[PDB]
Design a protein around this ligand. Structure first.
Ligand SMILES: CCCCCCCCCCCCCCCCCC(=O)OC[C@H](CO[C@@H]1O[C@H](CO[C@H]2O[C@H](CO)[C@H](O)[C@H](O)[C@H]2O)[C@H](O)[C@H](O)[C@H]1O)OC(=O)CCCCCCCCCCCCCCCCC
Ligand SMILES: CCCCCCCCCCCCCCCCCC(=O)OC[C@H](CO[C@@H]1O[C@H](CO[C@H]2O[C@H](CO)[C@H](O)[C@H](O)[C@H]2O)[C@H](O)[C@H](O)[C@H]1O)OC(=O)CCCCCCCCCCCCCCCCC
Ligand code: CLA
Ligand code: CLA
Ligand code: CLA
Ligand code: CLA
Ligand code: CLA
Ligand code: HEC
Ligand SMILES: CC1=C(/C=C/C(C)=C/C=C/C(C)=C/C=C/C=C(C)/C=C/C=C(C)/C=C/C2=C(C)CCCC2(C)C)C(C)(C)CCC1
Ligand SMILES: CC1=C(/C=C/C(C)=C/C=C/C(C)=C/C=C/C=C(C)/C=C/C=C(C)/C=C/C2=C(C)CCCC2(C)C)C(C)(C)CCC1
Ligand SMILES: CC1=C(/C=C/C(C)=C/C=C/C(C)=C/C=C/C=C(C)/C=C/C=C(C)/C=C/C2=C(C)CCCC2(C)C)C(C)(C)CCC1
Ligand SMILES: CCCCCCCS[C@@H]1O[C@H](CO)[C@@H](O)[C@H](O)[C@H]1O
Ligand SMILES: [Cl-]
Lengths: 334, 137, 451, 81, 342, 34
């Protein structure tokens, strides 16, 4: 029992209140760093010249923001994709003006959250479980990579990364629609089916299981006391649930295998969010949604507008107003 | 509304002679314009120099006038600046510079007429949309 | 029907190829049949591209991804990337297509006719996944093959016509590479560059001497390690770190391929040396710089002093300073000042863009090249409408760089998911709980409670 | 089970296919002819490519009154010469 | 008493392939007509006289751009009955005037009522609690507030959503430019309920699938389950320890877990519906007055809030003339808001 | 043994019959020229 073996057994111990593990050795310092910088910057950081045109945007609470408008502002367009740690600035004041905090937060967060995915794999190994909960987490994780890293790479600048804020999120979404027509992209459409479908199946499963709870309690108590943690027997009658839902639609549209039902609940939103993530990541390289602008032409050649052309009018209004002082030449090529 | 011979009748030269194109010429002109020209001139504007468009009114005040078949066919052989003062074959696609603009190598005289005809007919169809830019999309 | 249903094998039909894990003879067939599919596509797609190819149009206006790979190797093209002979494209297509029949034949034979297992038939071609010596020997064979493959590229560059060099004086041309870079500080210095802006890690390789010399190093390294892994067996520290199973080996390769797919995505998006813009179209950064260049040229011709024109923000309308002082194009393209390309570098001085060269030395071929690349920026819709999302139909264009980057990001992403899937499963199966928790032996019931 | 004949039973029976090798193409062709005779345009009131506009007008025939809307459409339809 | 009522009751509740029930008398015609009207309209019917748009396969639209569009703004909130004073029994005029839109929306409304009566009816026959019907109140609140209350507060049905893919996208973008709907906290709660619902769905399914007991020998774990087995098929104890150690907290009560999965998406949809009721009256969360006072007086003050309003103003000015043709907006080029160069 | 005309039969055909008719109508539209 030497000191390295003692340390290894504590790191990988299944008795810690929170599991550490080898992934946790990276996860913990990187998430702490990102969290501490985020909180301080959200409250107190001075305005940031996001678009590199010497037009600083105020993101913090002390500089006139509330919870809805506040943000950690992405780093300067003059920096592009250059690495900008604190020690590359001549002073902290320079680093703050140029949006140094954004880079420090996202790089530490992406590291920590990737390790959070490994840590999910790791603990499942130590406890004797099957290993794929982390595969489900890869879908939200891939999405974070798409809006903080992949889209900056394809567009050449972290200043087009998603801001760390509520209104900054909306700004990102609107500009995205103007330049890529994401609503008309099938991968975003699959994403919407993923989350709408996930919400639907969530309420579906919850209502069916809740509707077939076996009577174990009186009317004056919560039905929740009819289940005891660790009891051997199931707490609801899946045959009754299947008999209700099979008659609601038809028999063969209803599950009677709890394992394949629960697999479907896992797979539908995960797959859908993978597609949403891949949409952002492929529109990062400007393969955009369907363009049916002026697709319908009459006999003489007049343009007959469709709803797609009305979408185009909306997108143009977003296009011409976004970053109103940032373009000198007629084409917004990135 | 229909693509009629009236629509397809355009000025042949500056002296007022008209020529009437066939539907096939018009459609061939559209295809060849997309092949050789629309990468800069989509919709009748000019992406590398938005000050000059392909509106008939703009073509009429060029030097020499370009609002007719002969003027446009000549422009595609030996393009000039708007005031006629300089020859710009070295930076604009033309038959004279087909060596450096290889897409011009397989255009025949008949093709130039059809492209020319497309440029003159389209504003009669689209109105302000032709040469108007995003405002009219 | 050996192992050909769920009862015998334990795998349902939707995991049916897992029934092949311990059937090396059928498993050999599956792999050879599949390789035939790859070689089939390469040959057939090339012939399709050739049949649809108009030599007067730029390749990148025609939806081509394979012919550009052949042209880059120096076949079929001359000065400026002009196509001089389409016959080599024909040959490459035909020979791959004919070969796929041979591979398809062996694959179909081994899959359904030959011995299902090879261990009874030949101890040389038979293998056990758990046999660490045999597994590294098969690995060593394939490293030697890969090393020969890398040296074939060197042979083409140095002895069989050369490579297309976008940087060659006079506009780009096929050039024989006579002095490949061999200094290992240069070759391996690429590996230690930051991957961030202005550095670019290995994606920044910008000259053929470094490309050819790096393949010399890679070829020798692969052949050496191939011999090393034939002669040796894994050391004790390596034995204790890995899982030794078929599924585990698959998962390591899935990890490796995912990483390579992401690198390929950035290579084709940023690099204009081994993906020449003459064939693939301009990079995104390139077209953005070309717009700035185009309007600088237009306005200067109208009499503007572009060095001293102040733009609406106070930064130069045309020119400004990078954060380290270099003179660069202005506007939103300030983010792209790391761009280097043959049409632009003649205007570059020690301090960046040189105002005297801008005023006096811009040649018409540069104005042509910047107007072409500005109007062929890699932007376009899924139905191949070229340009910004609000553009109208007219131009049938999506850049090959967008096609190659998006497809390989999608593939690399799913191959990372496959690595997680199979690495997690390989660990669980080796330890014995990939089918669930043993009720009588549930590990958590033997652990102290957390609170 | 609910007593109806299984679907897999029915659609593998020769009699099913004897009947439906006729009824299915007959319906498809009826659908084709609904369009190719131009009847679909007249039933639903949908413009043909040559009837969105009059030859020189560029204004939409937009309905602008509630209770004379029927007459407004009929007037727009006359003006097509 | 076994009269005709009871004999009909017998036939309606026969255990057949498609259950019918008393609710089926409302449900089946209304659902079928709403669906048939949408397919009929998207295949054959134009929007030329109501919107200036092509909108059917017949006109050349594809699956993304077909729609049954709303009626003309001049119809107001008219029921647009086929026998009403606008169409006067003329089926062709009715189609051209937008009669199919109210037809789909009204038969759809009663169809939805019929589906929820069906959930109650079947639940009462089988002997289960009616929580599936209670959860379906959330889709009904959404449909009623977006497709009926919202246009009823506006000038006419024209501003309701049109029934089509790209038409709904236009509806989303209209709501940003005109209502600043992303800023609305009732929408925010809806987003939380929907994304949180999707989260719960994925995480509960993956947890069950990765804490399964080994109840069989096959590598495909699906076969080792029997619908009438009494035992839980996965380990609640191991699931609880895993999540407690990964995330800090975990479910320990499986009945609470599944009630929560009902609660979260249902409550979210209900909140979003309340916000849309407000938008019916233009009672928006459009501005923060404190931001506007500061920004009016201090031309150096800029936030992501003020940036988005500029985007909204672009949306309004550039889409309004085509999107609202009955208003006859003529906006000369010189009044259109535009940044530099673009 | 089994009946032919059931409720299920009616439900199947109220959906399937118009579907085929509509698919023929939409197939014909692919050849319409302006
Ligand atoms: C085992 C794993 C261990 C992990 C190790 C962690 C260490 C750090 C990881 C890397 C972090 C990368 C961040 C920056 C990525 C980037 O900006 O990438 C860009 C670089 C390329 O750099 C560019 O390279 C260019 C080089 O071109 C130059 O040279 C050219 C020569 O032709 C041209 O002339 C050109 O004009 C000229 O500019 C320039 O230098 C640019 O400024 C520069 O940005 O890509 C590259 O280095 C190569 C590609 C790197 C991979 C990209 C990341 C993908 C990750 C996906 C993860 C998904 C996760 C899903 C979760 C579920
Ligand atoms: C829950 C689960 C439910 C399940 C689904 C149920 C489905 C049932 C379907 C019911 C459909 C109801 C249709 C209502 C149509 C309507 O309203 O049509 C509207 C008409 C009023 O007509 C409108 O009237 C307006 C005002 O006009 C008035 O003012 C004008 C201008 O000054 C002139 O003076 C004019 O002559 C004068 O009439 C304009 O003229 C409009 O164009 C015109 O459409 O009212 C009327 O028919 C009747 C109005 C009184 C009853 C309203 C109660 C029902 C709706 C409640 C919604 C609240 C809406 C408020 C916003 C929140
Ligand atoms: C690249 C794709 C690929 C390849 C190479 C293979 C290969 C194989 N599969 Mg797998 N499989 C695949 C995809 C693939 N599969 C997919 C997509 C699924 C899901 C549907 C499966 C599901 C699956 C199951 C459930 C099983 C397999 C099995 C097998 C093995 C035996 C097949 C057999 O005996 O059938 C015999 C079939 C025939 C004799 C019919 C014709 C087959 C030939 C090969 C067609 C070739 C046509 C070709 C054009 C001829 C060219 C000849 C010319 C070159 C001269 C074989 C090695 C089996 C196995 O593991 O056994 C141990 C098995 O049980 N597969
Ligand atoms: C070199 C790559 C490679 C190889 C050799 C394998 C091999 C295997 N995989 Mg793995 N896998 C991989 C990559 C690979 N995988 C990747 C990249 C992923 C992420 C998506 C996975 C995710 C995965 C899962 C989740 C599972 C496996 C499983 C398996 C085993 C059974 C596979 C089977 O029979 O499928 C049969 C093939 C099919 C049923 C066909 C799938 C159809 C796909 C989805 C169509 C894709 C669409 C197509 C690209 C385009 C549309 C086509 C359309 C228009 C016609 C086998 C050992 C199984 C296992 O664990 O066994 C131990 C299993 O459960 N794999
Ligand atoms: C590396 C892969 C790759 C890339 C980058 C390209 C790129 C291109 N192809 Mg090529 N091609 C490929 C593979 C590729 N192809 C393959 C495998 C085939 C045989 C099927 C072809 C056969 C082919 C033909 C016949 C043609 C092209 C053409 C083209 C050009 C136009 C593409 C287009 O319009 O797509 C349209 C876009 C789509 C069809 C989108 C597909 C979406 C898929 C189905 C989603 C799949 C996601 C994932 C794989 C599934 C995951 C499922 C999950 C459960 C795990 C473009 C340069 C055209 C051209 O211009 O030739 C000169 C042309 O005519 N290609
Ligand atoms: C990597 C692929 C691969 C591997 C490992 C094997 C392995 C085997 N094959 Mg199979 N086979 C393959 C591909 C492969 N084959 C192909 C492509 C075909 C169609 C031509 C066949 C058709 C085939 C038949 C008809 C038979 C076998 C048999 C065998 C077994 C004995 C072979 C032997 O001892 O040859 C000794 C070695 C040689 C004769 C040297 C051959 C050198 C080749 C021909 C020249 C090229 C070398 C160079 C590396 C090729 C580069 C190709 C690259 C560009 C792709 C052995 C297990 C036999 C068997 O199964 O017994 C029951 C058998 O009867 N194979
Ligand atoms: C496909 C190619 C391949 C594969 C699969 C293997 C596989 C193996 N090698 Mg072999 N090897 C190869 C090629 C390959 N080798 C080549 C070309 C050479 C000649 C250079 C060698 C020379 C060699 C030696 C001398 C040894 C091995 C050993 C081994 C075994 C242990 C590997 C290990 O622990 O890596 C894990 C990797 C490390 C421990 C590296 C350090 C960890 C760093 C920090 C990770 C950095 C990752 C980072 C993201 C890098 C990004 C890029 C970077 C360059 C900037 C394993 C069986 C060992 C063995 O057991 O021999 C029998 C051993 O001693 N190999
Ligand atoms: C970008 C590389 C271009 C392509 C391809 C084509 N044109 Fe062009 N055109 C371009 C520019 C920059 C200009 C202005 C030239 C100047 O400095 O004066 C033009 C001009 C024209 C004109 C004159 C328009 C006018 O109002 O006088 C015409 C008639 C014209 N271009 C036609 C034309 C044709 C027919 C093309 C395909 C063969 C074509 N252009 C391609 C830029 C580019
Ligand atoms: C195993 C298996 C499988 C798979 C298989 C495979 C994958 C196969 C492959 C195969 C292949 C891979 C094949 C190939 C073949 C080829 C061929 C057969 C070719 C031919 C060619 C020719 C004949 C040519 C011609 C020509 C010329 C020469 C010139 C030009 C023109 C032309 C083109 C005409 C599956 C999945 C099904 C399942 C079962 C099992
Ligand atoms: C060709 C070329 C070149 C060169 C190149 C080179 C030279 C390369 C190299 C490369 C290399 C040389 C690479 C390497 C890699 C490595 C890796 C990738 C590793 C990994 C690792 C791992 C993965 C591990 C893991 C682990 C851990 C960490 C712990 C324990 C356990 C385990 C083992 C699991 C140049 C650029 C000049 C130019 C162009 C061309
Ligand atoms: C309105 C109205 C009415 C009614 C009518 C009806 C009732 C109709 C129906 C109709 C119908 C009932 C129709 C249908 C149609 C269908 C269709 C048109 C379909 C199509 C399909 C498809 C196209 C598919 C596709 C796909 C998908 C989706 C996915 C999978 C794969 C695939 C690709 C296959 C009446 C007379 C009463 C009165 C007046 C008004
Ligand atoms: C509305 C339906 C109300 C039921 S009404 C009821 O129906 C019975 C059938 O059981 C008859 O015997 C009885 O006379 C009649 O009043
Ligand atoms: Cl700009």
């Amino acid at each position: 029992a030497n000191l390295w073996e003692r340390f290894c057994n504590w790191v990988t111990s299944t008795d810690n209140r929170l599991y550490v593990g080898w992934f946790g050795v990276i996860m913990i310092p990187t998430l702490l760093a990102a969290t501490i910088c985020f909180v301080i910057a959200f409250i107190a950081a001075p305005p940031v010249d996001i678009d590199g045109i010497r037009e600083p945007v105020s993101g913090s609470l002390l500089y006139g923001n509330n919870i809805i408008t506040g943000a950690v502002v992405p780093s300067s367009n003059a920096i592009g994709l250059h690495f900008y740690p604190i020690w590359e600035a001549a002073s902290l004041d320079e680093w703050l003006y140029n949006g140094g905090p954004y880079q420090l937060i996202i790089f530490h967060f992406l590291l920590g959250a990737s390790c959070y995915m490994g840590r999910q794999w790791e603990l499942s190994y130590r406890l004797g479980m099957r290993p794929w909960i982390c595969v489900a987490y890869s879908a939200p994780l891939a999405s974070a990579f798409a809006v903080f890293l992949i889209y900056p790479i394809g567009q050449g600048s972290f200043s087009d990364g998603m801001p760390l804020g509520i209104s900054g999120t909306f700004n990102f979404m609107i500009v995205f629609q103007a330049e890529h027509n994401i609503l008309m992209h099938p991968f975003h459409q699959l994403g919407v089916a993923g989350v709408f479908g996930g919400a639907l199946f969530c309420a579906m499963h919850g209502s069916l299981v809740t509707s077939s709870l076996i009577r174990e309690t009186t009317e004056t108590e919560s039905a929740n006391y009819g289940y005891k943690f660790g009891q051997e027997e199931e707490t609801y009658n899946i045959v009754a649930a299947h008999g209700y839902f099979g008659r609601l639609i038809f028999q063969y549209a209803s599950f009677n295998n709890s394992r394949s039902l629960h697999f479907f609940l896992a797979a539908w939103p995960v797959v859908g969010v993978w597609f949403a993530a891949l949409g952002i990541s492929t529109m990062a390289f400007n393969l955009n949604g369907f363009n049916f602008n002026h697709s319908v032409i009459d006999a003489k050649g007049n343009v007959i507008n469709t709803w797609a052309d009305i979408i185009n009018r909306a997108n143009l209004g977003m296009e011409v107003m976004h970053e109103r002082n940032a373009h000198n030449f007629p084409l917004d090529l990135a | 509304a229909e693509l009629t011979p009236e629509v397809l009748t355009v000025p042949l030269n500056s002296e007022g002679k008209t020529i009437t194109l066939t539907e096939k010429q018009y459609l061939e002109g559209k295809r060849l314009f997309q092949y050789a020209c629309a990468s800069c001139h989509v919709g009748g504007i000019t992406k590398t120099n938005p000050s000059l468009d392909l509106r008939t009114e703009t073509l009429a005040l060029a030097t020499p006038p370009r609002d007719n078949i002969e003027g446009l066919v000549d422009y595609m052989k030996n393009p000039t600046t708007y005031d006629g003062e300089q020859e710009i074959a070295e930076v604009h696609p033309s038959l004279r510079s087909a060596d450096i603009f290889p897409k011009m190598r397989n255009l025949t005289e008949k093709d130039l007429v059809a492209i020319a005809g497309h440029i003159l007919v389209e504003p009669k169809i689209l109105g302000d949309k032709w040469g108007g830019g995003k405002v009219y999309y | 029907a050996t192992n050909r249903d769920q009862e015998s094998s334990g795998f349902a039909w939707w995991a049916g190829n897992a029934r092949l894990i311990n059937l090396s003879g059928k498993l050999l067939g599956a792999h050879v049949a599949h390789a035939g599919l790859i070689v089939f596509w390469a040959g057939a797609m090339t012939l399709f591209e050739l049949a649809h190819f108009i030599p007067e149009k730029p390749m990148y206006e025609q939806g081509l991804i394979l012919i550009p790979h052949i042209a880059t190797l120096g076949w079929g093209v001359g000065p400026g990337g002009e196509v001089v002979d389409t016959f080599p494209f024909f040959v490459v297509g035909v020979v791959h297509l004919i070969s796929s029949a041979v591979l398809g034949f062996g694959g179909v034979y081994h899959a359904i006719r030959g011995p299902e297992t090879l261990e009874e038939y030949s101890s040389f071609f038979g293998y056990d996944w758990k046999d660490k010596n045999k597994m590294t020997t098969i690995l060593g064979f394939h490293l030697i093959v890969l090393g020969i493959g890398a040296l074939l590229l060197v042979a083409k560059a140095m002895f069989f016509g050369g490579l297309y060099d976008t940087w060659a004086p006079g506009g780009g041309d096929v050039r024989v590479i006579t002095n490949p870079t061999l200094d290992p500080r240069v070759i391996f210095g690429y590996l230690l560059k930051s991957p961030f802006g202005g550095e670019g890690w290995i994606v920044s390789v910008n000259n053929l001497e470094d490309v050819v010399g790096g393949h010399i190093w890679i070829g020798l390294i692969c052949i050496a390690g191939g011999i090393w892994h034939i002669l040796t067996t894994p050391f004790g520290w390596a034995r204790r770190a890995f899982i030794w199973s078929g599924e585990a080996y698959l998962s390591y390769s899935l990890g490796a391929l995912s990483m390579m797919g992401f690198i390929a995505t950035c290579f084709v998006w940023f690099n204009n040396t081994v993906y020449p813009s003459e064939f693939y179209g301009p990079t995104g950064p390139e077209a953005s710089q070309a717009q700035a260049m185009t309007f600088l040229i237009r306005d200067q011709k109208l009499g503007a002093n572009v060095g001293s024109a102040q733009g609406p923000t106070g930064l130069g309308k045309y020119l400004m300073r990078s954060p380290t002082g270099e003179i660069i194009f202005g506007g939103e393209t300030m983010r792209f000042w790391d761009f280097r390309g043959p049409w632009l570098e003649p205007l570059r001085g020690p301090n960046g863009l040189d105002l005297n060269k801008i005023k006096n030395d811009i040649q018409p071929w540069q104005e042509r090249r910047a107007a072409e690349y500005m109007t062929h920026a890699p932007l376009g819709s899924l139905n191949s409408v070229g340009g910004v999302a609000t553009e109208i139909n007219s131009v049938n264009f999506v850049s090959p760089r967008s096609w190659l980057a998006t497809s390989h990001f999608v593939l690399a992403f799913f191959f990372l998911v496959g690595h997680l899937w199979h690495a997690g499963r390989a660990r669980a199966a080796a330890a014995g709980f990939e089918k669930g928790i043993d009720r009588e032996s549930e590990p958590v019931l033997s652990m102290p409670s957390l609170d | 089970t609910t007593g109806e004949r299984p679907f897999s039973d029915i659609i593998t029976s020769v009699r099913y296919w004897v009947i439906h090798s006729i009824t299915i193409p007959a319906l498809f062709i009826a659908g084709w002819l609904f369009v190719s005779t131009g009847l679909a345009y007249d039933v639903f009131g949908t413009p043909r490519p040559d009837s969105y506009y009059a030859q020189e007008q560029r204004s939409i025939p937009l309905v602008t009154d509630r209770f004379e809307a029927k007459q407004q459409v009929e007037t727009f339809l006359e003006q097509l010469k | 008493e076994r009269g005709w009522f009871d004999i009909l009751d017998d036939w309606l509740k026969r255990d057949r392939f498609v259950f019918v029930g008393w609710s089926g008398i409302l449900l089946f015609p209304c659902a079928y007509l709403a669906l048939g009207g949408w397919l009929t309209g998207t295949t054959f019917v134009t929007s030329w006289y109501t919107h200036g748009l092509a909108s059917s396969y017949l006109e050349g639209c594809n699956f993304l751009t077909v729609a049954v569009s709303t009626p003309a703004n001049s119809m107001g909130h008219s029921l647009l009955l086929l026998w009403g004073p606008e169409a006067q029994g003329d089926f062709t005029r009715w189609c051209q005037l937008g009669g199919l839109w109210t037809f789909i929306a009204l038969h759809g409304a009663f169809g939805l009522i019929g589906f929820m009566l069906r959930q109650f009816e079947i639940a009462r026959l089988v002997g289960v609690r009616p929580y599936n019907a209670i959860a379906f109140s959330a889709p009904i609140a959404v449909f009623v507030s977006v497709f009926l209350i919202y246009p009823l507060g506006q000038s006419s049905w024209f501003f309701a959503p049109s029934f089509g893919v790209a038409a709904i996208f236009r509806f989303l973008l209209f709501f940003q430019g005109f209502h600043n709907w992303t800023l609305n906290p009732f929408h925010m709660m809806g987003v939380a309920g929907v994304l949180g619902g999707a989260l719960l769905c994925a995480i509960h399914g993956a947890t069950v699938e990765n804490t399964l007991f080994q109840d069989g020998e096959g590598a495909s774990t699906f076969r080792a389950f029997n619908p009438t087995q009494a035992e839980e098929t996965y380990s609640m104890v191991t699931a609880n320890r895993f999540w407690s150690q990964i995330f800090g907290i975990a479910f320990s009560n499986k009945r609470w877990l599944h009630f929560f999965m009902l609660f979260v998406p249902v409550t979210g949809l209900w909140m979003s519906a309340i916000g849309v009721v407000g938008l019916a009256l233009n009672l928006r969360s459009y501005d923060f007055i404190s931001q506007e006072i500061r920004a009016a007086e201090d031309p150096e003050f800029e936030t992501f809030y003020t940036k988005n309003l500029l985007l909204n103003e672009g949306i309004r000015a550039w889409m309004a003339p085509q999107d609202q043709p009955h208003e006859n907006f003529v906006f000369p080029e010189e009044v259109l808001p535009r940044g530099n160069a673009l | 043994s089994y009946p032919i005309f059931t409720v299920r039969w009616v439900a199947v055909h109220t959906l399937a019959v118009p579907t085929i008719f509509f698919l023929g109508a939409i197939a014909a539209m692919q050849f319409i020229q302006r």
